[PDB]
Curated annotation (Swiss-Prot):
Belongs to the inovirus G5P protein family. The keyword DNA-binding applies. Homodimer. This is DNA-Binding protein G5P.
């Protein structure tokens, strides 16, 4: 479990439907690169939704280390480029 600090500056959240788009069944809601853990201020870490997750909480959120399928995919890639767990 890792923590992120998705600031409200770009914390837009659009509820995703079952099928928002034939290509992408769920809408994307990415914010910025923020993590509550690192050298000091939010390090550069995005909680890439990757349509596998919705936007959650503005300001502060947590990007699970297991914020991706492990073993089932083998990679934390499912929709697009994803960042490894912050630490």
């Amino acid at each position: 479990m890792i923590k992120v600090e998705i600031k409200p500056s770009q914390a837009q959240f659009t509820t995703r439907s079952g099928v928002s788009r034939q290509g992408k069944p769920y809408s994307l809601n990415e914010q910025l690169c923020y993590v509550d853990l690192g050298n000091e201020y939010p390090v550069l870490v995005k909680i890439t939704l990757d349509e596998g997750q919705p936007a959650y909480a503005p300001g502060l959120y947590t990007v699970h280390l297991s914020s991706f399928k492990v073993g089932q995919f083998g990679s934390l890639m499912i929709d697009r480029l994803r960042l490894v767990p912050a630490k």
